[PDB]
Design a protein around this ligand. Structure first.
Ligand code: COH
Ligand code: CL
Length: 210
């Protein structure tokens, strides 16, 4: 009754805290790593965003939650543009390989794609895109300040088509509240949001491990 958006934020709050406190992300954001480690992160993100956006496309094409699944949110192509700049070459696409965590995350996203699992997809959409909308300005500024990354290579963190980010985030949360879901679908979505945070935490863990 608080609304699905508020339940999601409460349910995932601890997982969000654990992700912020992960050693790799904490070290990266504090300036203790470098542009190389930042670029390795963006490469792994390109892999899972590519899979996520295949799943989004399939669910949108099935007619589920179409207005929530705004294609302007797509991050895979802008990540590739950033990586072409960061690596000074397009050849990173033929050099990178998924970490074990990314393999697992991509496997889940491909099952969601194949099953056209709308509620599961919405959970992953919330976990990635609402986080991106919330954190992009602060993370981009940290990469620029600590590592000298030019804003031209921080496009992943920017949504130039969204004139008022807060208005958009509030509208996005209201679209979540407005979804019509059965009790099973709602519980499935909430459980998948927890799983989505775990997948993302493990991407950071793998990056920290090397
Ligand atoms: C720059 C620090 C930082 C990091 C490392 C970080 C790491 C991650 C991460 C990595 C696993 C994921 C999946 C997310 C996902 C989210 N983050 Co952040 N977030 C971060 C800064 C924020 C900020 C700031 C907000 C808005 C306030 C809040 O809810 O915490 C945020 C909010 C979110 C929200 C929206 C909550 C809501 O309003 O319902 C999601 C989803 N997230 N975040
Ligand atoms: Cl894209």
């Amino acid at each position: 009754t608080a609304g699905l958006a508020v339940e999601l934020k409460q349910s995932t709050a601890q997982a969000h805290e654990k992700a912020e406190h992960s050693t790799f992300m904490s070290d990266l954001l504090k300036g203790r790593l470098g542009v190389a480690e930042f670029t390795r992160l963006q490469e792994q993100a390109w892999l899972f965003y590519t899979a996520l956006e295949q799943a989004v496309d399939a669910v949108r094409a099935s007619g589920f939650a179409e207005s929530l699944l705004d294609p302007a949110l797509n991050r895979a192509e802008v990540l590739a543009r950033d990586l072409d700049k960061l690596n000074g070459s397009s050849e990173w696409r033929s050099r990178i390989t998924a970490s074990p965590a990314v393999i697992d995350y991509v496997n889940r996203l491909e099952e969601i794609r194949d099953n056209v699992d709308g509620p599961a997809l919405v959970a992953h959409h919330y976990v990635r895109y609402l986080g991106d909308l919330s954190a992009g300005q602060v993370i981009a500024r940290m990469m620029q300040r600590h590592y000298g990354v030019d804003p031209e290579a921080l496009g992943f963190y920017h949504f130039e088509g969204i004139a008022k980010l807060k208005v958009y985030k509030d509208e996005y949360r209201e679209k979540l509240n407005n979804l019509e879901l059965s009790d099973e679908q709602r519980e499935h979505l909430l459980k998948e949001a927890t799983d989505a945070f775990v997948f993302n935490h493990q991407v950071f863990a793998d990056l920290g491990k090397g």
